[PDB]
Write an enzyme that holds these catalytic residues in place. Sequence first.
Site, PDB file in Angstrom:
ATOM      1  N   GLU A 135      56.598  55.711  31.499  1.00 42.80           N
ATOM      2  CA  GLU A 135      55.259  56.317  31.690  1.00 42.80           C
ATOM      3  C   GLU A 135      55.159  56.841  33.122  1.00 42.80           C
ATOM      4  O   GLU A 135      54.632  57.938  33.348  1.00 42.80           O
ATOM      5  CB  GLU A 135      54.157  55.319  31.410  1.00 42.80           C
ATOM      6  CG  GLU A 135      53.968  54.933  29.878  1.00 42.80           C
ATOM      7  CD  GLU A 135      53.369  56.137  29.159  1.00 42.80           C
ATOM      8  OE1 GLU A 135      53.012  57.141  29.742  1.00 42.80           O
ATOM      9  OE2 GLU A 135      53.328  56.039  27.932  1.00 42.80           O
ATOM     10  N   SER A 149      41.291  65.005  30.838  1.00 44.28           N
ATOM     11  CA  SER A 149      41.337  63.578  31.212  1.00 44.28           C
ATOM     12  C   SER A 149      42.552  63.414  32.137  1.00 44.28           C
ATOM     13  O   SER A 149      43.370  64.352  32.163  1.00 44.28           O
ATOM     14  CB  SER A 149      41.517  62.679  29.972  1.00 44.28           C
ATOM     15  OG  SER A 149      42.732  63.106  29.277  1.00 44.28           O
TER      16      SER A 149
END
EC number: 3.2.1.17
Length: 129
Positions: A35, A50
């Site tokens: 990630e 976002s």
Amino acid sequence: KVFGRCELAAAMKRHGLDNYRGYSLGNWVCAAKFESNFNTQATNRNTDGSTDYGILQINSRWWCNDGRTPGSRNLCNIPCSALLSSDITASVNCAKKIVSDGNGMNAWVAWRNRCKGTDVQAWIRGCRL
């Protein structure tokens, strides 16, 4: 801060993530690696406007407030900025709520695509734990 593999595994263990909701330590380490490459300061913006923050790339639409995601829900009750700290406590605490939300680790796209079903135990091999 940029963590080393074993160093992060050791912090996540201390923070209660090994086997949290059935996910072994290796799953968490693998997720972090893909990630954020273990960098607490990682940010990435999405098309919907976002932003994903921190070691576990937690998203501003549901989980934290960044003051720029119209109609965010702030479920972890924290400014997204808190997820970039060198102390991963806020990140871990929020992650525990996400993983508990009904889809498990599938909430993390890089886990689903690059970790899920692989030998995750390889991520904690050699570590003193």
